[PDB]
Design a protein around this ligand. Structure first.
Ligand code: NA
Ligand code: NA
Ligand code: NA
Ligand code: NA
Lengths: 774, 803
């Protein structure tokens, strides 16, 4: 009875003078026919393009959506509900000219019952001009607001618009507003307890209903069924309490769920819905590690923001499924869901894929606001816990991030922050004492929460990455339960560096440095039995408004995957440590030209979970090596080999004995011995073409025509004519202003079956041109 | 007072969009921090949010909040003085902050207002926060032109509701005692031989000084004194009548000899001497019942125009120099009357009307939509009172307007004629309570035509309705409906540089005799009955003939008060995205950058005595027709006789006679030779004993053209770093398509930039061709570029520009 409203919407950037402007009669070419609206499909985000456009501040302000709804309720005397998965940031909802609901909060789910407004509209003289449909107009507003969380100091876009699914939901008279499955598993894992509680939605005040509660195991076999006859379907009710002996356990390697099926019956309705849950025991050891179902489990974590190339926050379910599968295939078993509550599609995927969850409210930097600010934080914390309570994946409710970060107010009061942090902590425990509270980086609050994360960015923002174990050990001693969220480093995808390698005769923001940093962290974690776990920050490159000068402007490039899902070299480092499915990856798939002296022995890294690997350079074996994680780097699978000036073929063959499987990888790399002077010119060429799209390549060269392989110079693309740049993707090959990667830059052009001229600019160099014909 | 009044033009920054709170404007911000975004833009005031996006063809103009910030160096020269921010005008809702303290707010984009910031400045400079600003005072200003149905004007209006600090913002230092208001009440006796002046003032006296010596001096046009009096020991608090005097045989203000008096007031204490001045004029005005208009006892035909505060490159943020040039251009065209668009305009404009001799109708922006609630009504009342109080002393003003097209509905889901009448009568009564020496007026609200003193209907003959030859008869019918008839708004659009051999070609379906009023749908380019606004080619050739006809008819309308053409200069409007210049109302006789159109000279030839002569077609390079066709040549001149020469051969002398339409008898029918022709006209004006001449060169093309097939693009000229690029549409055989109106799109890639978004036919990156041609300038930036030229269904063409 749930209908995703995706088609037949129009969008207007900016505010209207009042709801009448959205629904008034408008003749073509009249004053009412401007401003001009844009047809869109939902989900939609205001900032799909301007978040990463290098020349503008992303839009923070009001915008409007409008559609015409075809209403046909299948239930007698039923309800019509608009169910928002999420919308940013302040939203107001109108049926014709009537305000029917509002919400402040960009990340929690909420809904509006429009039954009465629809009836009144359809019964009015105004309904005729809409020809049987009902006009729905929605205002979303992501204006900057110091008294609203999150803070504009945060390292992510505070996006605007209907960027998660909006559903039309038909209901009978009596339905469920919330279903809470309170499940607990004893330490000995042999007794599970389930309490089935619900909150009824009952606007007609039906006095009695028959409610059936049925519970099915992972194989869909019934383990409990009971009908409560003549229950009062009003407010909160405990429906069932049961003990399940030897329940099937939820685990990160074998995620298995139970299903609770609830039916509400009256003479006028039979309504069934279901909710999943899982049995699992979790324990944080005092000054010790983390245990799932009585066994120590090292949390192998990442993070994600709701952000994607081309769409900003408006990701589809299919995009979310692909991303979460990519994480699972990398070996992830833990995720902190960025700085806010995320789509329930994500939480369902964590339940189904076996990924434990830390989910937090966006009280993220700035200090502490007034009464409205505090009320929003309380409301979003309660909403998050109430809404996501049943997911077995969730082990931590987070209360905030970097709350020691000041300057959203002219005062900063540590004591007021502590007092409010303890209030939130106490509230979380009243709502759900089966999970741990946590925060990240607020040392003066580290005594308040159950689980604490400091800031540890060894080898990126401070120190060297060989400091990682020492800092983690020191920090774990300061708190009862330590869990390290956020670490890593930026890499401009397709930029590599010889300086990062141990070459035989350190590249920050290259992929070459970050693979070594990740490699080191993961091998250290094999020697830290006291460690709960960590979460790398983030899985995927994402846009941020506070980094206009990054190699990709306005993108945090610490991901191991590009903003369009393209894996970086660092993805395979994690995969080689964290998975058993045999794989093998020679570093440098996107590294076309290496460099150095003629007789240099160049370091070659292979990231593989195979037991032994043989490397071949230009067909000549360089010997077999056995994998050994502690033999850093590359877990012993490294070689130092001479490259030929010119083209080289590097091949690796690995075997994994347990799987009895052999796998191979091959790359081609040029080797350049010529040294280069400063950049002198841009050489522009058509690299390839596929259908209507052309791939254009830029190479920076010096006054003698030598490739400037260490150049990071910014390159600007422009086009005039029939085609268009495929730009503003937030990727190193989808950016019209981008730093070179080893003196190179690529961009794709949509030719539109016509002719164009591309111009390539770089400061102080002559502008270059490339003709593109169809 | 110029010595005390400082225009704050430099060292501002501008942010499009809102802040989360005043703290974001003044908080410490390190480079590369989160506080360092969003990025602000350095600007010089005056500034308008919409300088570019109002005419940009691909976006809706921005209606929303924006911020300005500066650091003020404060040094009050007066002991215990006041510090005031004086706004000439800002759009539309404005909030003012000194550091974190809100010190003032205003709703209304067109009235002047001020804020005393003395105490906030003192409190800031004495605080611990002052140190980090190094002796300067942070001033942050939020301006907001968000759409708002409960604020006038309406977004249904045919002009941009602009945002920003688009008129001068002044820093004003005052001593303890100053003048808050100076009101000069002047009246002129029956025989024009006795003038009466009452000098009234309101004091600004926050320190409660008990006594002052006040001098009142009145000076004539030479700034020599005709009256002087010192009031010793007056109470400088509240209102005081300072002087009442009778001037025998006063010098009269007239449209041909504008002469002003100046009233100079000085207030002295032991601690101060403060002088300010205000100008005024003596003149008698009378609207005759069912009759014409009299200035100083003689009938004066009002020869009128309108203007919007809007200009190429700057939107509403015009400088004083730009305003001076525009008003001088009007005066040189023969204008003696102006209706100042739909709102109060800069006091610079009013001062120029006083000095140049241009009578004024000025109105509040209650412009379309119906009628809002209590806040809406309070704003209209406030802006009416502000306009009358602020502009009361200008002798140019004869009419306070109460609104325009108030019969135009749909800003509300109700439209109540009785409520509109009740509020209209309240405004009318307020105007007369404040200033009974002037007439009230409205335009186009027939169900209110009994309320105001002076009424204008809608008469757009030959444009939005009917044919322009019905102009006089429609005017005759309309004038009989009201006591005092005054026709404001008429004319037609012309795409500058577009001309036509047959100006009446596609005007066959238009029906005469059934009115000339603009009704609902007429302004749109779609639907509706046939009308030149929709069916005309929008050539200058049509509007020149439409204007010519109107002006010669007015010489035979002795009962007519006068008229005002709409407008003087092309201006941007948000409701016309599909115009030949997108988002520009092209009815002006001057382009949006001050370039005169051919229609400017039609008015000038009818309305001025200074000898001039203008052959029609200065911007018409290629005429066309059959071999040996006799082509019509029009000359617009105020000379008594004109001789025309075509290729050196005299075509005979013709005598000027306004009623011998068209061109007042100064027309010839001459053969052009295929190729280039030189047309020369020599006129003599007997009264001045002066001879003047004009010359143009035109090509003549006999080849017929097929449909447009290609765009031929060339470098036409270059000047320094600027290149002039020309597009010519040609058919499959290479013949110029001289009647093409096809839209041309310019793009550039490389070092240069298009000189576009000017709202002119040669400054638009998307523009309809004028006789198959399109021009645009490129700033080369001393580098290399490729220009692309697109047109629907035609191959895109390219031009390389090297430096
Ligand atoms: Na941006
Ligand atoms: Na905020
Ligand atoms: Na526009
Ligand atoms: Na309005």
């Amino acid at each position: 009875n749930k209908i995703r409203l995706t088609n037949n919407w129009e969008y207007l950037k900016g505010d209207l003078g009042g709801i009448w402007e959205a629904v008034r009669p408008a003749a073509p070419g009249s004053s009412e026919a401007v401003p001009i609206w844009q047809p869109v499909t939902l989900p939609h985000c205001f900032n799909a393009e301007d978040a990463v456009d290098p020349d503008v501040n992303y839009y923070e302000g009001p915008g409007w959506y409008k559609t015409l709804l075809a209403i046909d309720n299948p239930y007698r005397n039923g309800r019509i509900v608009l169910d928002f998965d999420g919308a940013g940031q302040k939203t107001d909802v109108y049926v014709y000219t009537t305000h029917v609901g509002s919400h402040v909060g960009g990340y929690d789910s909420w809904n509006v019952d429009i039954t009465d407004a629809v009836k009144a509209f359809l019964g009015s003289k105004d309904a005729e001009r809409f020809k049987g449909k009902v006009p729905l107009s929605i205002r979303c507003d992501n204006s900057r607001d110091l008294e609203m969380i999150p803070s504009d100091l945060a390292d992510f876009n505070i996006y605007g618009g209907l960027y998660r699914y909006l559903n039309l939901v038909y209901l009978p008279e009596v339905s469920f507003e919330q279903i809470h499955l309170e499940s607990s598993l004893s330490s000995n894992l042999k007794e599970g307890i389930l309490k089935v509680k619900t909150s009824f939605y009952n606007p007609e005040d039906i006095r009695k209903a028959d409610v059936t509660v049925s519970v099915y195991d992972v194989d869909r076999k019934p383990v409990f069924s009971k009908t409560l006859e003549g229950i009062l379907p009003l407010g909160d009710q405990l429906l069932a309490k049961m003990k399940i002996k030897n329940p099937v356990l939820w685990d990160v390697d074998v995620p298995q769920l139970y299903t609770c099926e609830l039916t509400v019956k009256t003479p006028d309705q039979t309504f069934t819905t279901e909710e999943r849950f899982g049995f699992r025991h979790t324990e944080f050891k005092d000054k010790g590690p983390f245990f799932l179902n009585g066994k120590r489990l090292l949390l192998r974590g990442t993070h994600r923001h709701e952000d994607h190339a081309g769409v900003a926050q408006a990701m589809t379910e299919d995009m979310m499924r692909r991303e979460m599968r990519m994480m699972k295939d990398m070996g992830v078993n833990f995720i902190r869901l960025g700085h806010y509550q995320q789509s329930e599609i994500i939480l369902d995927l964590c339940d189904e894929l076996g990924i434990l969850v830390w989910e937090e409210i966006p009280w993220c930097r700035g200090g502490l606001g007034g009464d409205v600010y505090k009320k929003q934080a309380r409301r979003m914390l309660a909403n998050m816990i109430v809404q996501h309570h049943n997911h077995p994946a969730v082990i931590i409710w987070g209360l905030g991030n970097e709350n020691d970060w000041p300057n959203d107010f002219n005062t900063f009061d540590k004591s007021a922050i502590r007092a409010f942090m303890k209030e939130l902590h106490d509230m979380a425990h009243r709502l759900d004492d089966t999970r741990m509270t946590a925060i990240r980086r607020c040392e003066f609050c580290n005594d308040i929460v159950d689980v604490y994360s400091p800031s540890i960015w060894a080898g990126w923002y401070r120190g060297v990455f060989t400091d990682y174990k020492s800092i983690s050990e020191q920090e774990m001693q300061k708190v009862k339960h330590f869990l390290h969220v956020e670490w890593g480093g930026d890499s401009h995808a397709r930029r590599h560096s010889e300086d990062a390698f141990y070459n035989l005769k350190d590249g920050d923001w290259s992929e070459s440095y970050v693979v070594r940093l990740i490699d080191w962290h993961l091998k250290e974690q094999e020697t830290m039995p006291w460690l709960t776990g960590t979460a790398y920050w983030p899985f995927k490159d994402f846009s941020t408004p506070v980094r206009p000068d990054n190699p990709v402007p306005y993108v945090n490039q610490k991901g191991v995957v590009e903003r369009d899902f393209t894996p970086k070299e660092s993805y395979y480092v994690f995969q080689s440590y964290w998975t058993e499915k045999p794989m093998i990856h020679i570093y440098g798939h996107t590294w076309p030209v290496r460099w150095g002296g003629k007789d240099d022995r160049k370091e070659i890294l292979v990231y593989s979970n195979c037991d032994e690997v043989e490397l071949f350079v230009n067909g000549v074996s360089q010997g077999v090596k056995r994998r050994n994680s502690q033999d850093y780097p590359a877990a012993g699978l490294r070689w130092n080999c001479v490259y030929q000036e010119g083209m080289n073929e590097i091949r690796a063959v690995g075997v994994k004995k347990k799987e009895k499987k052999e796998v191979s990888d091959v790359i081609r790399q040029e080797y350049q011995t010529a040294k280069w002077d400063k950049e002198a010119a841009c050489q522009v060429s058509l690299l390839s073409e596929e259908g209507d799209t052309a791939l254009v390549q830029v190479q920076l060269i010096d006054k003698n025509g030598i490739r400037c392989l260490s150049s990071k110079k910014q390159i600007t693309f422009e086009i005039a004519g029939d085609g268009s740049l495929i730009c503003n993707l937030g990727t190193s090959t989808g950016s019209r202003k981008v730093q070179a990667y080893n003196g190179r830059a690529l961009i794709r052009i949509k030719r539109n079956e016509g002719n164009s001229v591309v111009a390539v600019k770089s400061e102080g160099l002559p502008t270059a041109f490339l003709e593109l014909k169809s």
